[PDB]
Design a protein around this nucleic acid. Structure first.
Lengths: 85, 163, 105, 114, 306, 30, 123, 122, 38
RNA sequence: UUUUUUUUUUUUUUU
RNA sequence: UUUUUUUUUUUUUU
RNA sequence: UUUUUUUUUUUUUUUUUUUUUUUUUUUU
RNA sequence: UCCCUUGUUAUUGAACAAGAUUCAGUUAGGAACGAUAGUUCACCGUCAGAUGUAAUACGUGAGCUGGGUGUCUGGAGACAGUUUGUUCCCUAUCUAC
RNA sequence: GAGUCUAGCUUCAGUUGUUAUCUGAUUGGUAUUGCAUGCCCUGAGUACGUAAGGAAAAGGAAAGGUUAACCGCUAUUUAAACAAAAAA
RNA sequence: GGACUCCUUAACUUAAACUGAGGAGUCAAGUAGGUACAAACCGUACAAGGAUUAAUUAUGUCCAA
RNA sequence: ACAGGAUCAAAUCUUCCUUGAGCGACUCGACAGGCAAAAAAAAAAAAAAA
């Protein structure tokens, strides 16, 4: 475009063959790109343990011992929830 | 006219706690391909048929792409087209055989591909930029294109590609 | 043929709510003349050129209008048909004991 | 037609002699009859009581005016009338008045057909 | 094919050799010799469309009305518009009607063309066009169109080619501003185009850039209103303006979209064609109905400052 | 200084036909 | 040149009724006036084809107005000659001649040849 | 407010659509070289034809009813139910007159028509 | 209203009787016969 | 739960 | 799960 | 008689207007 | 989701009218001048077109210029116009006894 | 082999969003609206509200402004001034 | 009185390809290979010369290959 | 094209089948027209006969 130089992160986004609607979302943060697919970012619940795929190799042993949620979003009773960076 | 299109996730459950959070289809539930109720006779598919011809040397391969994956099908087709499966393969020439594909409408796509996929067409010195066409339009208008483009982009980038 | 142009455009249509009908379409999708961008080899050339002889050879060998017609039909795509080819086929058809004028063949 | 920086007279008997146009709803200087415009008073009589910035409407125009019936109407001068509270400030209008005036102030004129 | 100075004198002297005006009647009666046996009344449907017509631009005129308001109307003449052939889904693959217009000398028509006319049983034609319509409005072959197809007071869609002006400048074509005539301005700058692109960041001129070139000769479309029609001479008066030269071919069809919705809603029209009943008279001339309200009414508009 | 915003220039609907456009169309397997 | 520019530029251009001549209008008219008298005095003149097609316009009008035999027409005829010899000839040899001729007293003949020094057509 | 849903509005808009081109040749519809003989029956043929254009039974009926002469019209009203549905289903044999109208609506012949032409042999 | 009018070579006769075109010197096979070749 | 990663040159995700 | 669906909801927990 | 806005008319169609190209011809 | 025009109908200390924050599209139509020249900002007067932002080498100087807090006649890219054709300039001479 | 008119493809922005059941001879069964500046009129001095005050659904019209087209009318400029009688 | 990288460290906004120190490799003066696209990174039984041959390396094994 | 074919066989006016879709439709086979003179905003206007 008109801009001479662009950030690598922005450039990456620019290369995504998706609709504008999803592009905007992706940019914002409501959505992520992984394995050539777009899905909701992981949910981090208060007190519960995070997915084993996001923690460091040495943190998995301690993460596995934390409580786990095996219910639906409606049944979830977490005091606070947010997307995991 | 004044709002975003109705996606496939509008007609089903949402499960964020899973890989396939929502199922996607090229068409709505009420719009999916169907067969006419009065079958004048029942039919059976042969999967694939092959015709050899020693005299003219042109071979034919008729396939049934019913419920198959686009990628896999394309990959398979590429091989045949290229003619690499033969011993006497010459990259200089096109040593392949003719391939026929049917039931292209019945193809499948894993993940959120039906609702989060587009196709770009380059334009020579255009201010608006490349033309973007959604996959639902292509499915609605010409299903064959879905496979056609996958095969095309799979084939080597050379002067033989057209052939 | 330095450059052979061939593209499959997105033609107008209506596939939405399509009903499966056990019937053939109008015609083939691809109609453009196929032009090679490379010189053929001896075997290729031979295969391309042997028709001129094979036609006559099989016409002669044929022993019925059915066979004659079949033979003729097989070499349909064969362009550049000389007048005498017709004459030969006619003579054979008359000798075999007639034919079916109404025949698509 | 009329344009900014234009001097036009007054048909009313208020006392003002002439005024300079300040604004108009036009771009190409084609001011028509019956168009609202802002005027700045330049001269006044010793017994005048008009404001500094009266608001009025174009009554007469030098340039010819086309009619719906294929006729044309022309004048010799450009004059306006002051308007206040959707009514004229004065009580009489000097000279004739054209028919092409949606406003009811034309009734005060002496000859509407002339 | 005479000289310039001969043609110029001809142009002036032509006026002296005008035939007397015809005699126009008040009524018209048709017989079975002017009616297609195959012609019949067909009820319309929700997905039914009519056919178009062809015309030649003659010239402009000014006409009054019932209220006395003068309006400018262009005169159009249908030069014996006759159907030639029809198209079917089975035969061709699409529903359409082919029509012809005009006349050509026999000493200019090719033999293959004359073969068509022999079959058609019609005199040589100058121009041939085609219309797409619904299958339920296919007119019979050999039927002659009439001015009665369009009812007065309806909206029409007119299409035609614009005039030619040859080569023109940027300032002449588009209407560029340019530069001042004074204050130290170069000669060339008077009518120069100015900036035509960006810096090295964009090394390419965008497509469809406004530049100098040959002007005119383009297709254009416009809406028109049926003001008056003539049966005798086959004449139509259209309110508005029509592009093209005084004699150029022009296509006329019905309203489309908003035009149809807003205007052409409450107007009864003969869908297929005009179907006269033998033994009954018809008017020759038809005028547009007058309005409801008085056009010459200037109400009071309050002007209150706030 | 004062500058009017010529937003009318941004028109993207119901544009007129041009020889440029026509040629563009033509070149694309018309 | 290129021979293509001529064609490119000529598209959508109307023809001129009166051919342009070198000089101001006052000069052009003088030129044509004098050439009319010289044509009257000779019986044939050799001129370029464009010019031959131009002088014929006034060559016809002179004789057309000379046959009226009216004071008014006489004035117009006077207004188109210089020398007395041309007046004498027009009024004594040409007027009697074309007594029965409604119009068209002159013609132009093309030589189908080019000038040696100019390579220009002749008539 | 009396405003309908946006979805509804859109649907409404889409419902009343019409085209003037066949389109791609790759489709399965009525085109050049069409033959009714392929179909098992007139009903199937009719169904196919109708589906090709995208017209409703109601509209078909409405058109025919208002087109047919009085004699045929009166009998049309004597059938226990819809005539179109019965013809489609193969539970009724339409008349020549009716067939004419049907073919006019669908823009395609349903049966092998006559050819009024022939040279008398001496 | 009606409208209209192992063995030695198996696939040839099937095509002939079904389709309506004879195979001169062209063979044909289907996936179902792949078991006799692996 | 795992095999599928910045595979972020394109297609593809066929598990 | 139902064309219910511009920021509005029902049924069933799959 | 011509040109022009200083006059007049439209502000609709986009599977529309329009177009330089009939393609079962796989080695001119 | 950019000053106005859209989201009937629940975010509101939203009675109506006139208003404030936030979000969404298949990205549809629009937005007038002048005085003083203090390199531009608070403000001033008129039509009320109705609180009117950035990037593009100051966007733009082989297109033009002005009172200071140089010149160049377009060779290749691009863009805007235009192109008869199988033939109608020339030439194109088997097989072999 | 050749003439005409045309099918398909291409085209500013952009989308895939349409039809269970089926009036028994009882006047019959969705239908060309995507779109949107300001002011005025009917609805209406109505809904609302002590009072002051003062809405929407739809249509209709007068200015201003942009694009395109044209010369019937008006304004500017400008050119032309020639062959009816066979008694000619 | 030297350009990049590894460890330690002075200055700076724990900023910058800067400014300056201690000790190893490479380039400078290095070929071909890998890293998508332009010395510095990995590997090398590392380029006298010629030919249609065999090998555990960085690293790969759905298609372009 | 009513051109071909079957039948204890059709109202005037072909009961039914074949012609892949009667070569995309019509038509022509001494078919078709580049350049010159003249004319010429696009466009149109000339029968042959030195």
């Amino acid at each position: 475009g008109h801009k001479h130089s662009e950030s690598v992160l922005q450039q990456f986004y620019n290369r995504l063959p998706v609709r504008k609607r999803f592009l905007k979302a992706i940019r914002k943060g409501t959505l992520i790109w992984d394995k050539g697919q777009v899905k909701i970012p992981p949910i981090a619940m208060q007190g519960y343990g995070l997915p084993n795929k996001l923690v460091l190799p040495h943190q998995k042993e301690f993460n596995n011992k934390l409580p786990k949620f095996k219910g639906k979003i409606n049944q979830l009773k977490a005091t606070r929830i947010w997307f995991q960076d | 006219s004044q709002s975003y299109p109705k996606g496939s996730f509008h007609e089903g459950h949402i499960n964020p706690f899973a890989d396939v959070q929502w199922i996607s289809r090229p068409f709505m539930k009420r719009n999916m391909p169907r067969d006419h109720h009065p079958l004048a006779k029942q039919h059976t598919s042969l999967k694939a048929v092959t015709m050899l011809d020693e005299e003219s040397g042109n071979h034919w391969h008729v396939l049934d792409g019913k419920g198959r994956s686009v990628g896999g099908l394309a990959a398979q087709v590429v091989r045949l087209l290229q003619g690499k499966h033969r011993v006497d393969f010459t990259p200089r020439t096109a040593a392949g055989d003719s391939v026929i594909v049917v039931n292209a409408i019945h193809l499948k796509m894993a993940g959120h591909t039906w609702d989060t996929k587009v196709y770009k067409f380059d334009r020579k010195t255009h201010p608006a930029g490349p033309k973007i066409i959604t996959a639902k339009t292509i499915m609605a208008r010409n299903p064959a294109m879905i496979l056609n483009l996958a095969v095309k982009r799979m084939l080597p980038p050379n002067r033989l590609r057209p052939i | 043929f330095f450059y052979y142009r061939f593209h499959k455009r997105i033609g107008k249509g209506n596939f939405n709510r399509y009903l499966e009908f056990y019937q053939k379409p109008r015609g083939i999708e691809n109609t453009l003349r196929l032009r090679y961008n490379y010189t053929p080899t001896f075997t290729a050339k031979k295969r391309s050129e042997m028709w001129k002889v094979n036609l006559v050879k099989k016409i002669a060998h044929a022993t019925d209008a059915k066979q004659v017609l079949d033979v003729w039909t097989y070499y349909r795509h064969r362009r550049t048909k000389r007048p005498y080819h017709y004459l030969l086929a006619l003579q054979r058809l008359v000798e075999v004991g007639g034919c079916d004028p109404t025949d698509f063949r | 037609g009329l344009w900014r920086q234009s001097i036009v007279r007054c048909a009313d008997n208020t006392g003002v002699i002439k005024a300079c146009i300040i604004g108009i709803r036009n771009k190409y200087g084609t001011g028509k009859i019956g168009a609202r415009i802002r005027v700045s008073v330049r001269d006044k009589t010793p017994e005048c009581t008009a404001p500094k910035m009266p608001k009025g409407v174009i009554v007469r125009r030098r340039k010819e005016t086309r009619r719906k019936d294929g006729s044309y109407i022309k004048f010799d001068e450009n004059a306006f009338v002051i308007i206040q509270k959707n009514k004229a400030r004065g009580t009489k209008i000097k000279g004739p008045v054209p028919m092409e005036i949606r406003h009811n102030c034309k009734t005060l004129a002496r000859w509407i057909f002339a | 094919y005479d000289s310039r100075w001969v043609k110029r004198l001809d142009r002036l002297r032509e006026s002296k050799f005008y035939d007397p005006a015809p005699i126009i009647k008040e009524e018209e009666i048709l017989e079975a010799d002017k009616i297609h046996p195959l012609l019949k009344k067909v009820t319309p449907s929700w997905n039914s469309r009519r056919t178009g017509l062809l015309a030649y631009k003659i010239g402009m005129m000014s006409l009054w009305d019932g209220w006395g308001e003068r309006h400018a109307v262009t005169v159009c003449q249908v030069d014996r518009c006759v159907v030639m052939d029809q198209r079917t889904l089975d035969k061709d693959g699409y529903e359409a009607c082919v029509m012809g217009i005009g006349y050509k000398p026999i000493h200019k028509v090719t033999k293959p063309m004359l073969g068509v006319y022999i079959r058609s049983q019609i005199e040589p034609k100058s121009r041939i066009a085609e219309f797409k319509c619904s299958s339920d409005c296919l007119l019979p072959v050999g039927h002659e169109m009439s001015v009665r197809h369009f009812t007065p007071g309806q909206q029409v869609f007119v299409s035609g080619w614009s005039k030619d002006k040859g080569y023109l400048g940027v300032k002449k074509r588009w209407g560029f501003a340019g530069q001042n005539a004074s204050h130290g301005v170069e000669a060339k700058a008077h009518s120069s185009p100015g900036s035509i692109g960006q810096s090295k960041t964009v090394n390419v001129v965008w497509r469809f850039k406004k530049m100098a070139g040959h002007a005119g000769g383009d297709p254009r479309v416009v809406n028109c209103k049926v003001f008056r029609i003539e049966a005798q001479r086959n004449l139509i008066f259209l309110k508005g303006c029509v592009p093209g030269y005084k004699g150029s071919l022009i296509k006329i069809s019905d309203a489309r979209g908003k035009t149809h919705h807003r205007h052409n809603r409450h107007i009864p029209l003969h869908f297929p064609t005009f179907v006269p009943e033998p033994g009954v008279s018809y008017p020759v001339t038809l005028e547009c109905p007058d309005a409801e309200q008085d056009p010459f009414l200037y109400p009071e508009i309050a002007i209150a400052d706030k | 200084r004062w500058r009017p915003k010529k937003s009318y220039k941004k028109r993207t609907m119901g544009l007129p036909s041009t020889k440029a456009r026509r040629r563009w169309a033509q070149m694309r397997r018309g | 040149g290129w021979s293509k520019v001529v064609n490119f530029l000529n598209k959508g251009v109307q023809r001129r009724p009166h051919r342009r001549l070198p000089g101001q209008p006052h000069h052009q008219w003088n030129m044509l006036k004098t050439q009319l008298d010289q044509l009257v005095r000779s019986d044939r003149l050799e001129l370029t084809l464009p010019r031959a097609h131009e002088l014929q316009q006034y060559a016809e009008e002179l004789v057309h107005f000379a046959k009226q035999n009216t004071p008014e027409s006489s004035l117009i005829v006077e207004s188109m000659i210089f020398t007395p010899a041309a007046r004498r000839k027009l009024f004594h040899e040409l007027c009697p001649l074309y007594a029965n001729r409604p119009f068209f007293y002159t013609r132009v003949v093309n030589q189908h040849r080019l000038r040696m020094r100019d390579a220009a057509p002749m008539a | 407010g009396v405003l309908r849903s946006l979805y509804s509005r859109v649907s409404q808009r889409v419902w009343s659509t019409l085209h003037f081109r066949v389109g791609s040749r790759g489709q399965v519809r009525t085109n050049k070289g069409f033959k009714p003989t392929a179909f098992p029956h007139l009903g199937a043929a009719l169904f196919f034809a109708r589906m090709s254009k995208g017209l409703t039974r109601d509209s078909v009926e409405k058109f025919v009813r208002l087109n047919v002469s009085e004699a045929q019209r009166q009998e049309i009203k004597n059938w226990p139910g819809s005539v179109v549905r019965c013809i489609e289903n193969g539970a009724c044999i339409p008349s020549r007159e009716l067939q004419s109208r049907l073919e006019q609506v669908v823009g395609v012949p349903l049966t092998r028509r006559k050819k009024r032409a022939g040279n008398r042999r001496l | 209203l009606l409208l209209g009018p192992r063995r030695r070579l198996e696939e040839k006769l099937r095509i002939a009787e079904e389709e309506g075109w004879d195979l001169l010197h062209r063979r044909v096979a289907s996936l179902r016969q792949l078991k006799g070749w692996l």
